[PDB]
Amino acid sequence: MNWTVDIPIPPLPTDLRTRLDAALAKPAAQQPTWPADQALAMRTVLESVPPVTVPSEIVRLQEQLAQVAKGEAFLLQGGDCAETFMDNTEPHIRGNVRALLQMAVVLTYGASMPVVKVARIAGQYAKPRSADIDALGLRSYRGDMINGFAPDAAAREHDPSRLVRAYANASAAMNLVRALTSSGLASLHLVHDWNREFVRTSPAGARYEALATEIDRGLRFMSACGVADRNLQTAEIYASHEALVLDYERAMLRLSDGDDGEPQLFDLSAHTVWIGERTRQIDGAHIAFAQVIANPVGVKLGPNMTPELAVEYVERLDPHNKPGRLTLVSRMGNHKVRDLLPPIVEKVQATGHQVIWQCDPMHGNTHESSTGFKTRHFDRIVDEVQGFFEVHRALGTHPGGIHVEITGENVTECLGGAQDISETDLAGRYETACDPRLNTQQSLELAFLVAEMLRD
Amino acid sequence: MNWTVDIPIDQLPPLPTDLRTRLDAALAKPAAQQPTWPADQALAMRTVLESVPPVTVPSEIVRLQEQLAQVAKGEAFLLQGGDCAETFMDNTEPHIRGNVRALLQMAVVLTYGASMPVVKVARIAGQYAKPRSADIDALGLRSYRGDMINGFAPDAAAREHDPSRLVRAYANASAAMNLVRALTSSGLASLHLVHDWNREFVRTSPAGARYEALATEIDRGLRFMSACGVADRNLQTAEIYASHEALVLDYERAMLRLSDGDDGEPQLFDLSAHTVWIGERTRQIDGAHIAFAQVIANPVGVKLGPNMTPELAVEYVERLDPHNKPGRLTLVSRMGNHKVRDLLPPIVEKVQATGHQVIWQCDPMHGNTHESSTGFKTRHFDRIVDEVQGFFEVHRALGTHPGGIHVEITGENVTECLGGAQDISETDLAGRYETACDPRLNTQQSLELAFLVAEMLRD
Amino acid sequence: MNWTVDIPIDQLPPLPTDLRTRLDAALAKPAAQQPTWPADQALAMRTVLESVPPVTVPSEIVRLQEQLAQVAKGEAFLLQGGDCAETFMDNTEPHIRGNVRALLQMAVVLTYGASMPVVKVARIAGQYAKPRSADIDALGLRSYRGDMINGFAPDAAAREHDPSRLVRAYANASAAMNLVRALTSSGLASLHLVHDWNREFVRTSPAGARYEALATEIDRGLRFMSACGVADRNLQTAEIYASHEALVLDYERAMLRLSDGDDGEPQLFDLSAHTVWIGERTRQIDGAHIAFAQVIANPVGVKLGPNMTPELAVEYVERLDPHNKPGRLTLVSRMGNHKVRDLLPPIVEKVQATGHQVIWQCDPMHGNTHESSTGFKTRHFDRIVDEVQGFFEVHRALGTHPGGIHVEITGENVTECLGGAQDISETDLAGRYETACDPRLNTQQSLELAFLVAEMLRD
Amino acid sequence: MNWTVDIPIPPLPTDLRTRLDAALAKPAAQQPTWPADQALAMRTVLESVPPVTVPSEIVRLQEQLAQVAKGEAFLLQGGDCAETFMDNTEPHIRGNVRALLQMAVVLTYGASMPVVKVARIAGQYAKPRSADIDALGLRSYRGDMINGFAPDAAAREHDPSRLVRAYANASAAMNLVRALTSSGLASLHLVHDWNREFVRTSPAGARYEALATEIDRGLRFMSACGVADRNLQTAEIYASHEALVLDYERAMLRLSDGDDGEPQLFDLSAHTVWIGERTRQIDGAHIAFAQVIANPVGVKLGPNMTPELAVEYVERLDPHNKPGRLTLVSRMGNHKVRDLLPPIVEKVQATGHQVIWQCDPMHGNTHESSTGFKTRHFDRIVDEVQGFFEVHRALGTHPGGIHVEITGENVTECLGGAQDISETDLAGRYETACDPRLNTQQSLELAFLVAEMLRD
Ligand SMILES: N[C@H](Cc1c[nH]c2ccccc12)C(=O)O
Ligand SMILES: N[C@H](Cc1c[nH]c2ccccc12)C(=O)O
Ligand SMILES: N[C@H](Cc1c[nH]c2ccccc12)C(=O)O
Ligand SMILES: N[C@H](Cc1c[nH]c2ccccc12)C(=O)O
Ligand SMILES: N[C@H](Cc1ccccc1)C(=O)O
Ligand SMILES: N[C@H](Cc1ccccc1)C(=O)O
Ligand SMILES: N[C@H](Cc1ccccc1)C(=O)O
Ligand SMILES: N[C@H](Cc1ccccc1)C(=O)O
Numbered sequence A, D: 001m002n003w004t005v006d007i008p009i010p011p012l013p014t015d016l017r018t019r020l021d022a023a024l025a026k027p028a029a030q031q032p033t034w035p036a037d038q039a040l041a042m043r044t045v046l047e048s049v050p051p052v053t054v055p056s057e058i059v060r061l062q063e064q065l066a067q068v069a070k071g072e073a074f075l076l077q078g079g080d081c082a083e084t085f086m087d088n089t090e091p092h093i094r095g096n097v098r099a100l101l102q103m104a105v106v107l108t109y110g111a112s113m114p115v116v117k118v119a120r121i122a123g124q125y126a127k128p129r130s131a132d133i134d135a136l137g138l139r140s141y142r143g144d145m146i147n148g149f150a151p152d153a154a155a156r157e158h159d160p161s162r163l164v165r166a167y168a169n170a171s172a173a174m175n176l177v178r179a180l181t182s183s184g185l186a187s188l189h190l191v192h193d194w195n196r197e198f199v200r201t202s203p204a205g206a207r208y209e210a211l212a213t214e215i216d217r218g219l220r221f222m223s224a225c226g227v228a229d230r231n232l233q234t235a236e237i238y239a240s241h242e243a244l245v246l247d248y249e250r251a252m253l254r255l256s257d258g259d260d261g262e263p264q265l266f267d268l269s270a271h272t273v274w275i276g277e278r279t280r281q282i283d284g285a286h287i288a289f290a291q292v293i294a295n296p297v298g299v300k301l302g303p304n305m306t307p308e309l310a311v312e313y314v315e316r317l318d319p320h321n322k323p324g325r326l327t328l329v330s331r332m333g334n335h336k337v338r339d340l341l342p343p344i345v346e347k348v349q350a351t352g353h354q355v356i357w358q359c360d361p362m363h364g365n366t367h368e369s370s371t372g373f374k375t376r377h378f379d380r381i382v383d384e385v386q387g388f389f390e391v392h393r394a395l396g397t398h399p400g401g402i403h404v405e406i407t408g409e410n411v412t413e414c415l416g417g418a419q420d421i422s423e424t425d426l427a428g429r430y431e432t433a434c435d436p437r438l439n440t441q442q443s444l445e446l447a448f449l450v451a452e453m454l455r456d
Numbered sequence B, C: 001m002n003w004t005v006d007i008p009i010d011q012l013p014p015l016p017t018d019l020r021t022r023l024d025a026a027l028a029k030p031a032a033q034q035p036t037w038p039a040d041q042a043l044a045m046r047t048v049l050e051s052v053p054p055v056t057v058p059s060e061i062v063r064l065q066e067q068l069a070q071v072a073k074g075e076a077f078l079l080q081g082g083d084c085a086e087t088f089m090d091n092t093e094p095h096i097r098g099n100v101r102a103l104l105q106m107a108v109v110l111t112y113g114a115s116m117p118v119v120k121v122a123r124i125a126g127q128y129a130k131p132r133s134a135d136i137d138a139l140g141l142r143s144y145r146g147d148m149i150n151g152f153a154p155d156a157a158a159r160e161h162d163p164s165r166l167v168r169a170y171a172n173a174s175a176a177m178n179l180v181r182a183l184t185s186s187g188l189a190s191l192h193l194v195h196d197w198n199r200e201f202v203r204t205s206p207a208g209a210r211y212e213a214l215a216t217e218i219d220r221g222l223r224f225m226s227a228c229g230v231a232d233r234n235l236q237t238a239e240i241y242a243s244h245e246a247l248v249l250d251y252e253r254a255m256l257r258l259s260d261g262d263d264g265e266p267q268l269f270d271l272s273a274h275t276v277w278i279g280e281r282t283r284q285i286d287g288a289h290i291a292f293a294q295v296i297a298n299p300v301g302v303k304l305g306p307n308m309t310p311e312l313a314v315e316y317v318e319r320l321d322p323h324n325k326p327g328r329l330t331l332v333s334r335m336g337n338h339k340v341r342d343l344l345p346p347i348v349e350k351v352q353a354t355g356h357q358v359i360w361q362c363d364p365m366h367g368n369t370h371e372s373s374t375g376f377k378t379r380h381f382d383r384i385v386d387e388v389q390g391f392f393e394v395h396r397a398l399g400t401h402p403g404g405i406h407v408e409i410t411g412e413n414v415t416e417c418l419g420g421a422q423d424i425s426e427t428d429l430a431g432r433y434e435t436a437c438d439p440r441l442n443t444q445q446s447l448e449l450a451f452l453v454a455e456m457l458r459d
């Protein structure tokens, strides 16, 4: 059966209405194709819901991301490639939040500064496609906000009812993320006890034992110095997703009050969003929509990026020079990061703006296995981050963070790591609805390796 | 042409067998006020709810339990409040924010006046159902049972009992709860900000002069904390818990979950809310609501009206608090202001004698409802104040703790209850009578009442 | 047969040459009220003091400076108090504890009433000297100049000026300061405990009824903090700073030390105290006290009596606050209650006009001293209250900050000042007139005055 | 010249007066010989002074020492062998406090629990002697509370005026210890920066670099976790001295209020005191005076101690079984600690009392050099602590702490350590008025070594 929602029956200031209309009249790639009257109806509903986030959390994220930009904190961004309606369950959510928290404790120690924790959750329900027609000859699956994963024509029709289903799934998950992080799951001592169990049972546990012991002693030190533990009991986890579907993003806009300067438009589907490689057209609607909202935004930069084009994103998206307003996410592939990134970094640094430089070591290293599965090699992922570190150290700039696809589940999607996942093993638990994710073990292992990168 | 959007539903281990076996035994009891829809459809919706993200988590409920234990011991005070009936249509950011705001305002004043913590519980995120007296409504239509069951609109189609609503209810509850959590951790519940709203109310209210001393005195108490250099993090956020009447057993049972036993034994919680209560209509001693309440580990409350006997109250205590956990059980009295002074004392004496430690909570609003000449179901402010007054006098005389209050309020400037300082009359009621069920004290009246009760606490 | 014990003295780099050269230039100025003892003996005692452990350290003084800057800006309030003249004989644990206690009691009340922090400064640990008018005392003996200089006892031998006292003074100052630090970090200065003493005073005082509302209101302010879950460490201890009139330049100069320049440039501090002031007798503009004050980095104060002109006050400001550091300089007014309203305004206007930010502090006690029929030098409570009243009215009218008070008090139940709620009369004075110099408000009177001044702060 | 104090011109409850009189009528070894009328006069003065400590600090020390006794904190006790009137100066005091704080940070890290810091200060002005007549043929110097260090008959006369001079010097120093620890000298970050400078310049700095870096990262971790730093800004340092001169100790008694049970006698010359080898007669006045006061007390136990005698001290001095009330200080010599301590520990553990076991690795290892100077070898000191650790690990009991003689000054009194102080070097800066102390460098080095003992 179905559940069914009623379509409901003070205007923006003029300049925001004009700028917003202007931004949305620009070309927009990768949009779903569904009737405009039905999309309007869905938007009317989403214009009336409880937002997923609120403005003052977003100004707080901004301030924390400014610290990152200045070289005083570090950003960790992670979760599923594609969340699905069917896996939006308590265990799946709790496990991803847990996977992210584990990595955080280790990176916090290794960087010797705060880690801003941003999950890819409560909203990554859509994806772009290079091909409208997939390898089975079906209309491509573009994520659950648009259509269905199942391989059949009917399920692949673009269905606007999904926009509301997506909000409903986002809100519920977010509710649970908030409950879990303020309720004990994000207690530092508890999270660190899970890291100890992993060191104990991982096949490469011995390799990571020193670092884990040193973290354990750091914690006991705090306790020994009688420091208050209130701040150890909870953590903040922000939500993020690629802003891809403009029907969804525009219905989730809300105007803030003037309790901070003038009223502004915030996208309250998330705390921060980014724009992918296939929608980053400089004169396109995604970049223009990003210029209009006050959220922190990110732009993915791949191997054809030029230094001049990167400067142009910075001048469009960070025109007031607010450190941390903009994050540039490098995804070049490991074999190319060392050569392609430096000139982009030098040129952007020369502008006097303060962007966060973030490494996406996953997307630029995807390949197909002999066994059929889309996959990435652990060592290639590690090595991109390694080269990202080297590029920054040579230029004296801040390696700001990482952006990774992970899960808390024990899936077999990426080859290698300590568990030595082979081409054979991939068939066991290849569960992603899109790209291959790091395992819970692999995601934690990578945090150990990166901590070392931070320590040297 | 329907003005509706259909949202498809797409059909985790079950609860363990020993718990399922106890739970089956309990829900075999008869259940009053249940929705009349097909069992096979109800099952299907329950199956969906059995696998969604819960609205609350167990360790928030163990923390509420501990705070309610302090209430039961006379060391905190319980404030419980919100809409009589939430609807899907008004489950919006501004309505939610205004109710949360109204509850916080009252809390600052009651905190000061009681000189002890206030456990703040709001009736939101799941209060979408109601019982009925009447088979058929005055319009000759099947009665409205709340949005979890059917539609308010006066037409046959909307009044059919629609199990899809079980899911729509969960979706609305989860979204509202999300927003309550955001707002209370993000600045809306900053003490200084909330108190500035109380100051604007004092400057503005027609009776502002009456409340001025208390407001100034609270202001100085705040400025003192700052002066002493102890204005810490704790002033910037507050906890607001969720509660609703547990009425629809299909909803409540599908939202049961087992705690993971990392901080005790594995237990059964209803994760549709932090705490729930059982209304007058469904509190049959051998009925399924009371048995459901015994089974879950959440704190629970039972409403007690004018026909309550002391022996029946004792039986609730022995059924629902059998392990003697202070604060596990709250007894709410809604006897009407003219009767509270006579009816409550013997009930209190008898329950005290059992050696259990219940929270005694006053529901002033329910026992004092009447119809106006102008049509509208309404309650009079002075009757509400006066029931709380008498509730305080009863406890004073017995040396027991007046534990808290349970009120129906909103942040909106509605005209549903007569009186208060704005002097709402019978003809004013027509202006903004917006409730989908009982009349709710408006934002000014709800705050005024908190001043009056603070005075009660102090003397 | 002497009733005395001789304690032998046994004779670190010097201060740097550039500072010594400036300091020599300054102390070549003439110095009023100095002790008449041999220079070679004074040198020897100074040599001993140049190498003892200081009484205070520089970073406490930089912290006092910052807190006094908040006073000067209208964001805190300064309370300064203790004995007129400490003696060696009464420099005991119970006397010290009772004075510290009296000051803390007043502070809680003034904190509440001012709704802002109180910088607590006590006249102890070094206030062992006094100026004189009279060559010869009424007994035909050389005058008593305080225990740093000679003996109180009425006999020629004791009245000889004895430089050994410089060391005895340091030893007593250091021991008393040790005990002040212990007591304030160890529980005597717990806010809840101090306030319970104020409650016992209210229950007991003959005017207790008059002060009851304010005391209850403070109690509720405290209970609020606890209710809000912010009753932190900061309520358990308080800082009390030391101060005395810098009169004897042999003492003060030997206690100079250079800060180590790990938190700024190297500077010269007088580490006999945190802050010192210069009295009416020694404030000559071209004299050595004012020049000594300019040279040290401590906060300093200057007493201003009824002959002060606005131009002379401006000159103090330009000499002592030449870098415009708010709170570096405090101007204290002791003009008598009958004259404060007329004399102070023009002084304030003129100093404000300079663009400097001084602390304006009231010394109610000094300008209101008289002799009773019964013999005793005394002050009347009502005159003291009334000078502070007028000091408040002056500042109100000009829109300037009444910055604080400077009072002579003790924790003992002495009978030195007439009036207050105990209604001390001329014949009661004989009972316990124990001061070695001016009359001091007793513990009840000192607390009563804090209530009255809190009322002044609030309106 | 001299300064001169006037002799001044509510009784104890009867039972305390009786118990106290009883205790002082017992034999008392090592007392000064000076006229009783003059001693009375001095006592009359000291009965009237501001105490050096107050009772509620002593109940707080007690509670913290109970944690030590239970295996949950660790005790560090240290300072000069003999303080003198002439070296009671701001730099000397600040340096000893600093030396103790440096060791503390390192031991706090290494033990992973709190360190109770107790200085031997504001009162160790007296010492016992084995010989009344020293090697020069003079009346022995017994410390500045009794007589003068200078080698001449006159200065060695026992002078009761010194009792008051001692209080005056104690009070002043204590004042300064309180000021310094609440004012910034005991800021953790500042103390740890001194440890970094020492690692950088010590000849064995490389050996200690790992541990120092690991502490540095532990501190930055706290900062990275946003923990409140108020408790990092100050430390508590308690005062202690051997209770040797009963004329001094008895004049510094004060009766507490009944704000905690019944009124009791506290010795307010210090927070805690101990009884040396030469005054610990079981039926002597020192042990009996210790039974009467409520302060935490310690008893030094040397190589002739039997297990039965140790049990008897425990039953006399800890008769109510208050954990931490009594500390037994082992000083056996390194060659003997392994053999002599175990049976003493087993027997005392069997009583069910909970004493603190503390190692004094200095006294049992003193020897004379060819060059004339009384001295101890660094390696012997380290090795006693090593064997003290081994004895406890084998029995599963808590190595509770150490008691050492140190200074902040760069003296040459103990041979060895990284600076490799030789017999020749001793002549340079042999400044102690009694036993040889560890250097600032040597004292810190020993804290590194002990941290390792704690870590393994
Ligand atoms: N203040 C918190 C500390 C914290 C609590 N849990 C975790 C888990 C992982 C890293 C850090 C923390 C914070 O840093 O967000
Ligand atoms: N610790 C919070 C104090 C608080 C913060 N905001 C409000 C609003 C209303 C009452 C109290 C508070 C608490 O007591 O819950
Ligand atoms: N933080 C302290 C508060 C305090 C503690 N004891 C007292 C006694 C009197 C006044 C204040 C306090 C302070 O304000 O200094
Ligand atoms: N709470 C303090 C922490 C501390 C501050 N300074 C130091 C110096 C050495 C060791 C510890 C500390 C404490 O542990 O006493
Ligand atoms: N798994 C979710 C269940 C859900 C229903 C309604 C709201 C939120 C979640 C879905 O299929 O949409
Ligand atoms: N007003 C809500 C809007 C809503 C839709 C979906 C989920 C949550 C809320 C409703 O009509 O159901
Ligand atoms: N009353 C003090 C006692 C004292 C003696 C020595 C030092 C400190 C205080 C005196 O007569 O000097
Ligand atoms: N060095 C101290 C100086 C001193 C004098 C008086 C009191 C305290 C210390 C002495 O010789 O006694």
Ligand SMILES: [Mn+2]
Pocket (backbone or CB within 6 Å): A081, A082, A405, A434, A435
């Ligand atoms: Mn992906």
Ligand SMILES: [Mn+2]
Pocket (backbone or CB within 6 Å): B084, B085, B408, B437, B438
């Ligand atoms: Mn109702």
Ligand SMILES: [Mn+2]
Pocket (backbone or CB within 6 Å): C084, C085, C408, C437, C438
């Ligand atoms: Mn005076």
Ligand SMILES: [Mn+2]
Pocket (backbone or CB within 6 Å): D081, D082, D405, D434, D435
């Ligand atoms: Mn020694």
